[PDB]
Design a protein around this nucleic acid. Structure first.
Ligand SMILES: Nc1nc2c(ncn2[C@@H]2O[C@H](COP(=O)(O)OP(=O)(O)OP(=O)(O)O)[C@@H](O)[C@H]2O)c(=O)[nH]1
Ligand SMILES: Nc1ncnc2c1ncn2[C@@H]1O[C@H](COP(=O)(O)OP(=O)(O)OP(=O)(O)O)C[C@H]1O
Ligand SMILES: [Mg+2]
Ligand SMILES: [Zn+2]
Ligand SMILES: [Zn+2]
Lengths: 197, 50, 348, 343, 199, 148, 103, 65, 49
RNA sequence: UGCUCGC
């Protein structure tokens, strides 16, 4: 039984994949006049570059629906129009654009700009930080080449690829490259004859 | 996957970890946050001196 | 004796993203242990790693040699690799939610009282900045009301304490600069800073971003060393989010809705473009059409139709930009250059 | 004039079409020239007042006049997180054959509020999982679902076919420890709502468990939060710049809340006026009408906060506000004692 | 139809990026494998692993591309002069004329520490000094400023105000920046070039 | 007296390029005694102005009329007889630019002082004789009082 | 071990002091900031959070003259305590008269 | 699977108002009027009760029993 | 295609090498007609927040 | 070895 934490990947049914960056308490969350605190706070900067107006339309339709007890339709090339959900919002006493007067929870003072609140259908993805967390000690090595194994289920270590070697060369760190690729990976002591080679 | 490209030029090493990243502005640009779990696994050999 | 100690604070540690395009894809940082389970770092270093925090997995290596540790800290130090070797442009700079926050902070509309200004200034007094004096700047307006402008609060980041020898000076043009004001632009888009004090202009990607030269952090790096630039970036990353959260910045469906004049202009432009395209079609199909040089008649018609459609597009975009009111979150983020542009706004 | 603008900035918070202005608290010494905003206990005790407008079970609404946004937010946050209560923490399970998962069952049991008075208990020390009479409570839940011996031939509804198929929280039985039976009369220690559906069972399945509840604050976990919704809002004060009459006045009654703007026929013509600005929620629908934008001025009173506190039923909300103020006083006293010990 | 066309364009962009990833990966691999041998020696000559010289001096001048402040230029003399004037404003020293500025520049440049500097940078410094001296002369001719220092409106001296202290600071700063912007011996210039071309 | 400049100005335009900012406006003003043009950013929210307003403006080195230039730090709480008592709108800024007029190619006698009151721009242009005492990197006080 | 004082530098200057408060949050920080900002002898008052993971806050006080900046701290604490006592008494009296007039 | 006891956003007790809501669905009440009669003013509890799917009985149909 | 949620009514008796289930799945408020056609609302894979 | 994924 797992609880959402830092590192869990979340989707918002619009290709806006995200990772939980911080878990703030309830009192730190901003609150409206009715006292509702948001569960998920998403960055607005993701909207202009991606032009996800459909997300805003879905939010508005969902807010109107949860206000009037209906299920609006987001059918392709159709569905409920913006005018209908705006009328549903203005009828219930809320703003016709979703933006509501919100007071900051931290300072206790109202915000200079209204906040876009609304119910969004967020879906959690199978990509978890707990399953993806990996750390490699000395551990086991392969029989053929005495190097760490490949995968995490095999208790493997991370590989310094060719491009990483190129970057280390460009930096000029000869000792670090030597320690990584020789000392810490496949160091060995052989016996060579100086006569025959 | 040959010896030169898979075992000589680029090979696997230990004392390393892989984890998903998350933002944290309260840290300096030259600092990185490491989980306690990975920190207990990745060890550093320190020589005893005076 | 050798003691295999746990990873503690201060250890130099390599941090890398497996897709490596340039050398800045892997850097040596200082490890700080946290109770969570993710690799956390300052978002200003996101541009070198080309990360976007949408599930990217990054690698973290621990050197097992003092010589390797020292070489990593010196050669691959984050403060020592603030600029790419390709063209010298700074990559580690302000990013989204830092360009917009600083832009809204340095706007001429900002006027803070003593309490809010003191709070915003103290928001950065953590870590090594706990052993310095605040040096509260004198207020601009004092007789009617004592108000501190946002530009002074931003300049406090450059020179926090009295003993700080940082004297930043810069004179450049912004993104929305008219071209004739010469530090007197109506939009106030001429950046001018004297003695680490923002005298005129508003911060944007052209001055705080990782685009090219004339960056304030680049000037600090080239004039006063790496440590001062790193401290300024840390103060910015600790100050801008606090003010951005205390002020509030949101986008709604009403921020992208078209106006009545915009709809009328779009209708007229579509009608005119369709009429001209029909005229061109009739001229090519029935009769002789003026053939452009270097191409056939069909390619000439294609070019003319593309020109008419682009005319419609750009005129509708200009009409939408003119009819849009200020404080619009898409327009605000497009002006500062943090994310998006006028083309995306016109399309959406 | 300038004085009117200064007073509006220092007393009112204006809500514009695109953004809100005058949101920062500025009544501080040195910010204003013609005003001595230095702290005065006498003026504060004179101007401050509390007026309760509505008070029923698990619901309170009261207006505070003279307090600031900082202290109001502090009270709200203390009520939300720093008020300690009793909630289920430990779950000992004996042969849980239910379809509902054991961890999910424990999580659902933890969210169930307890009517026990938290002031009569203490915080459990670090460790000590066995628990003592002072700092724990035990609730036994043993439900065995079986087929009804007497039912109809069809019995399509599960109610007639099976008995105890829905394990409500009323099946929880408080088991006294030590002398808790004598201190607490029968019926006091019990679930709050008594109708919460914990799980649903089938014949053959059985749910047997014991629940150890200890004192805790809402900051540690949301299950200790006594208040369901504890918030505060600035008191609106809608003002008319020019007298609005005629049919457009009716539009005002349709632009704002139905209960704030009232139309009256003083001379046979309808004229609108503000009746009760409290009921308005500031939907900002007056900005849609082009003509009626420059005739009204929406504003919020800075030093007038209407607090609405809806609790979960653990204790009446007035005692909750009292305990929040007591917790703030205790924090202040602890810090004063620490400072005195330092010096 | 518009949605279908937009999806077509998006898929075209996606396949373009998919091909570009592998193509540039192979190109970067080849470029780095070819260029990884070069290194900047201590005699300012770039030589290969076998000892053969590729360049007698890197880039013809020997400056670090990472420390290139201007547009393929080591310093922006205008910004440096403005910074020197702003950081060290000397109010107790009189302004300099064109002849005095040229004289003090020629006197400072002929010192020993400026001999090891490259001739092109010194010529650029002389050109910038001559340009700013011509600007000061034009300003003083427009506003009738006398070089004796006895003009009644002293604010006229604030138009183009320069003091020998600021001149020395500017020259020393330019010399230090040019010295610290040169190629540090031992740097893997070939790998840096390969990466800066492949990225 | 530390009065560097003092003159009565009349406003000729409020916003020649439109209502850019809600709180700040770019007033253009002309003096009566001399031909001193003034382009000044003012805060209309706390100090409203009109098109036909006429106001006296004084740029002083110090805020104390006795000549004490001790301005290491300003304490708003301190109460003492100062120059700001005789004016209504007081700003604190620094003269950050002194630029000669480039329109007149020869025999030019006009200068311009650019002062930044925390980003609020003030260009005072006119005869160099009136601008005596203005120096770069010098912090001054602006005092504006509307007249009848 | 809860509230600890820190001088501005090694010189041990009493004008600029930093109080580090443990197991606290924005509530008490903002309340004390508001209660001590009204003190005319305080030039700069400001509270901040080091990191959301750990529960600690840092307040910084810089006075005007030669105040040790510890006396304004105790002054603000006592003023906040008095305000809390007054609002508690007023709320109790209000609830009592409401209960009396309701029946 | 089953109706949650606490609301995600606010925290109002909503698990005890599920079956009665079903009764309001067994009666002639619609969604909106039933949610209003149940005492859910804020839209968060309305979304909690309306968007909830009762999957516990479908699982009990597959229970061992 | 990687969304977490319920699989079917027999997800408890089903034993697979890896299964992800949601504690309190909720049907979307803005549902397409395709959702009603494929009966996705009977087996949601997300929550409305 | 195969394949589905994660950027
Ligand atoms: N068909 C099939 N071939 C496999 C499998 N695993 C490995 N191979 C073949 O073996 C080669 C790779 O061998 P490895 O995966 O290194 O074998 P390994 O994991 O070292 O084997 P162990 O030492 O037993 O763990 C490939 O070329 C495959 O053709 C498998 O599961 N199925
Ligand atoms: N095949 C690959 N090779 C190298 N890097 C990859 C590959 N696939 C994904 N990545 C990583 O993911 C990043 C690609 O993201 P990018 O293409 O810039 O945005 P995007 O996926 O188009 O998102 P939008 O569709 O714009 O929202 C950059 C790269 O480091
Ligand atoms: Mg990514
Ligand atoms: Zn041999
Ligand atoms: Zn709710």
């Amino acid at each position: 039984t797992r609880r959402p934490e830092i590192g869990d990947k979340f989707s918002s049914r619009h290709g806006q994949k995200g990772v939980c960056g911080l878990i703030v308490p309830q009192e730190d969350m901003p609150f409206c006049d009715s006292g509702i605190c948001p569960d998920i706070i998403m960055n607005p900067h993701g909207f202009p570059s991606r032009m996800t107006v459909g997300k805003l339309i879905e939010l508005l339709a969902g807010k109107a629906g949860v206000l009037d007890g209906r299920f609006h339709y987001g059918t392709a090339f159709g569905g409920s129009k913006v005018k209908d959900v705006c009328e549903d919002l203005v009828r219930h006493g809320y703003n016709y654009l979703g933006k509501d007067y919100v007071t900051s929870g931290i300072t206790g003072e109202p915000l200079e700009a209204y906040i876009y609140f609304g119910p969004v259908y967020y879906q959690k993805l199978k990509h978890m930080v707990l399953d993806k967390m990996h750390a490699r000690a000395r551990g086991p090595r392969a029989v053929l080449t005495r190097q760490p194994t490949e995968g995490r289920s095999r208790d493997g270590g991370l590989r310094l690829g060719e491009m990483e070697r190129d970057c280390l060369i460009g930096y000029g760190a000869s000792m670090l490259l030597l320690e990584r690729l020789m000392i810490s990976s496949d160091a060995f002591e052989v016996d060579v004859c100086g006569q025959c080679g | 996957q040959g010896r030169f490209r898979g075992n000589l030029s680029g090979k696997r090493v230990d004392f390393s970890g892989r984890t998903v990243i998350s933002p944290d502005p309260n840290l300096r640009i030259d600092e990185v946050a490491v989980p306690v779990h990975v920190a207990k696994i990745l060890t550093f050999p320190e020589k005893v001196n005076k | 004796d050798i003691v295999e100690r746990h990873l503690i604070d201060g250890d130099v540690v390599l941090f890398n993203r497996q897709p490596s395009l340039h050398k800045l894809s892997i850097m040596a940082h200082l490890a700080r242990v946290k109770p969570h389970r993710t690799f956390r770092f300052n978002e200003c270093v996101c541009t070198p790693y080309n990360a976007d925090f949408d599930g990217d997995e990054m690698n973290l290596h621990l050197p097992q040699t003092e010589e390797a540790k020292a070489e990593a800290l010196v050669l691959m130090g984050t403060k020592a690799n603030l600029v790419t070797p390709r063209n010298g442009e700074p990559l580690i700079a302000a990013i989204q939610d830092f360009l917009t926050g600083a832009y809204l902070l340095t706007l001429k509309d900002t006027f803070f009282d003593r309490a809010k200004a003191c709070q915003i200034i103290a928001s950065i007094l953590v870590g090594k900045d706990e052993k310095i004096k605040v040096r509260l700047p004198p207020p601009t307006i004092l007789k009617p009301v004592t108000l501190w402008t946002g530009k002074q609060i931003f300049s406090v980041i450059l020179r926090p304490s009295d003993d700080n020898p940082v004297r930043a000076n810069l004179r450049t043009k912004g993104k929305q600069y008219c071209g004739k004001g010469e530090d007197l632009c109506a939009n106030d888009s001429y950046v001018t800073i004297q003695n680490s004090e923002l005298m005129s202009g508003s911060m944007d990607k052209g001055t705080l971003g990782s685009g090219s030269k004339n960056n304030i952090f680049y000037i600090l790096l080239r004039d006063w060393g790496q440590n001062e630039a790193a401290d300024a970036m840390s103060r910015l990353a600790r100050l801008a989010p606090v003010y951005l959260s205390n002020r509030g910045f949101s986008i709604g469906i009403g921020d992208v809705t078209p106006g009545q004049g915009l709809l009328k202009a779009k209708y007229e432009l579509l009608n005119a473009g369709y009429k001209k395209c029909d005229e061109y079609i009739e001229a090519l199909n029935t009769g002789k059409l003026q053939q452009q040089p270097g191409c056939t008649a069909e390619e000439t018609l294609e070019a003319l139709i593309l020109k008419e459609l682009s005319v419609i597009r750009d005129h509708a975009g200009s009409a939408c930009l003119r009819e849009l009111d200020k404080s619009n979150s898409p327009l605000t983020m497009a002006l500062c250059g943090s994310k998006g542009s006028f083309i995306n706004i016109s399309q959406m | 004039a300038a004085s009117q603008a200064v007073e509006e900035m220092r007393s009112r918070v204006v809500l514009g079409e695109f953004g809100v202005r005058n949101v920062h608290t500025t009544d501080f010494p040195g910010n204003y020239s013609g005003y001595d905003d230095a702290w005065d206990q006498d003026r504060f005790e004179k101007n401050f007042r509390v007026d309760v407008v509505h008070m029923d079970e698990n619901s309170l609404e009261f207006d505070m006049v003279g307090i600031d946004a900082a202290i109001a937010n502090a009270f709200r946050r203390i009520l939300l997180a720093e008020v300690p209560t009793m909630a289920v923490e430990k779950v000992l399970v004996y042969n849980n054959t239910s379809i509902v998962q054991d961890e999910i069952l424990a999580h659902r049991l933890g969210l169930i509020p307890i009517h026990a008075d938290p002031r009569l208990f203490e915080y459990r020390n670090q460790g000590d999982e066995e628990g003592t009479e002072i700092d724990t409570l035990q609730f036994r839940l043993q439900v065995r679902c079986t087929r009804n011996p007497h039912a109809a031939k069809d019995s399509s509804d599960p109610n007639e076919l099976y008995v105890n198929h829905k394990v409500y929280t009323r099946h929880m039985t408080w088991i006294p420890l030590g002398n808790q039976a004598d201190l607490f009369p029968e019926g006091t220690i019990r679930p709050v709502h008594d109708d919460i559906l914990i799980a649903q069972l089938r014949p053959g399945q059985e749910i047997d468990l014991l629940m150890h509840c200890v004192k805790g604050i809402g900051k540690d976990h949301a299950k200790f939060s006594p208040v369901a919704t504890a918030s505060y809002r600035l008191l609106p004060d809608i003002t008319l710049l020019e007298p609005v009459e005629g049919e457009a006045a009716e539009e005002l009654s349709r632009c704002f809340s139905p209960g704030v703007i009232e139309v009256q026929e003083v001379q046979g013509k309808k004229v609108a006026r503000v009746a009760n600005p409290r009921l308005d929620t500031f939907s900002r629908e007056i900005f849609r009408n082009e003509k009626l934008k420059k005739v009204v001025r929406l504003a919020r009173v800075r030093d007038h906060y209407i607090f609405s506190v809806e609790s979960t039923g653990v204790l009446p909300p007035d005692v909750l506000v009292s305990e929040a103020i007591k917790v703030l006083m205790g924090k202040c006293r602890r810090f004063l004692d620490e400072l005195d010990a330092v010096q | 139809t518009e949605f279908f066309f937009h999806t077509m364009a998006g898929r075209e962009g996606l396949v373009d990026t998919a091909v570009k990833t592998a193509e540039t990966g192979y190109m970067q691999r080849r470029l780095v494998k070819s260029l990884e041998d070069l290194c900047s020696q201590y005699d300012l000559t770039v030589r290969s692993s076998t000892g053969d010289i590729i360049q007698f001096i890197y880039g013809g001048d020997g400056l670090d591309p990472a420390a290139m402040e201007g547009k393929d230029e080591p310093l922006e003399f205008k910004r440096v002069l403005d910074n020197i004037k702003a950081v060290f404003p000397c109010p107790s020293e009189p302004a300099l004329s064109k002849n005095e500025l040229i004289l003090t520049t020629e006197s400072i440049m002929k010192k020993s520490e400026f001999l090891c500097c490259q001739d092109s940078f010194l010529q650029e410094i002389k050109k910038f000094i001559k340009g700013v001296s011509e600007k000061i002369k034009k300003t003083r001719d427009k506003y009738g400023i006398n070089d004796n220092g006895t003009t009644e409106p002293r604010v006229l001296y604030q138009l183009d105000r320069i003091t020998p202290t600021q001149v020395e600071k500017f020259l020393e700063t330019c010399r230090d920046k040019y010295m610290r912007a040169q190629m540090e011996p031992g740097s893997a210039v070939g790998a840096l070039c390969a990466q800066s071309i492949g990225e | 007296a530390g009065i560097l400049f003092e003159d009565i100005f009349d406003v000729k335009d409020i916003d020649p390029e439109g209502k850019k900012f809600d709180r700040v406006s770019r007033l253009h003003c002309e003096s009566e005694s001399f031909k001193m043009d003034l382009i000044l950013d003012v805060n209309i929210q706390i100090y409203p102005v009109d098109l036909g307003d006429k106001f006296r403006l004084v740029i002083a080195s110090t805020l104390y009329e006795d000549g004490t230039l001790d301005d290491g730090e300003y304490n708003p709480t301190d109460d003492r007889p100062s120059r700001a008592d005789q004016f209504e709108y007081v700003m604190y800024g620094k003269v950050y630019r002194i630029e000669g007029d480039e329109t007149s190619t020869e025999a030019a006698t006009r200068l311009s002082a650019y002062v930044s009151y925390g980003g609020l721009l003030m260009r005072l242009q006119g005869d160099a004789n009136n601008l005596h005492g203005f120096e770069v990197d010098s912090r001054v006080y602006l005092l504006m009082k509307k007249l009848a | 071990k809860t509230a600890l004082e820190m001088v501005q530098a090694a010189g041990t200057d009493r004008h600029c002091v930093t109080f580090v408060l443990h197991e606290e949050d924005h509530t008490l920080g903002n309340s004390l900031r508001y209660m001590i900002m009204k003190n005319p002898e305080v030039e700069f008052c400001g509270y901040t959070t080091t990191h959301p993971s750990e529960s600690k806050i840092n307040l910084r006080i810089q006075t005007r003259g030669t105040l040790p900046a510890v006396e304004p701290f105790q002054r603000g604490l006592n003023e906040l305590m008095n305000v809390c006592q007054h609002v508690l008494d007023k709320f109790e009296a209000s609830i009592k008269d409401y209960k009396d007039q309701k029946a | 699977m089953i109706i949650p006891v606490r609301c995600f956003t606010c925290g109002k007790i909503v698990g005890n108002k599920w079956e009665a809501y079903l009764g309001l669905l067994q009666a002639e009440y619609t969604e909106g009027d039933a949610l209003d009669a149940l005492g859910l003013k804020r839209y968060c509890c309305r979304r909690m009760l309306l968007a909830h799917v009762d999957l516990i009985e479908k699982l009990l149909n597959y229970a061992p029993l | 295609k990687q969304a977490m949620g319920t699989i079917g009514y027999n997800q408890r008796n089903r034993i697979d090498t890896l299964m992800y289930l949601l504690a309190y799945p909720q049907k979307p408020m803005v549902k397409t007609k395709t959702i009603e056609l494929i009966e996705f609302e009977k087996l949601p894979a997300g929550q409305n927040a």
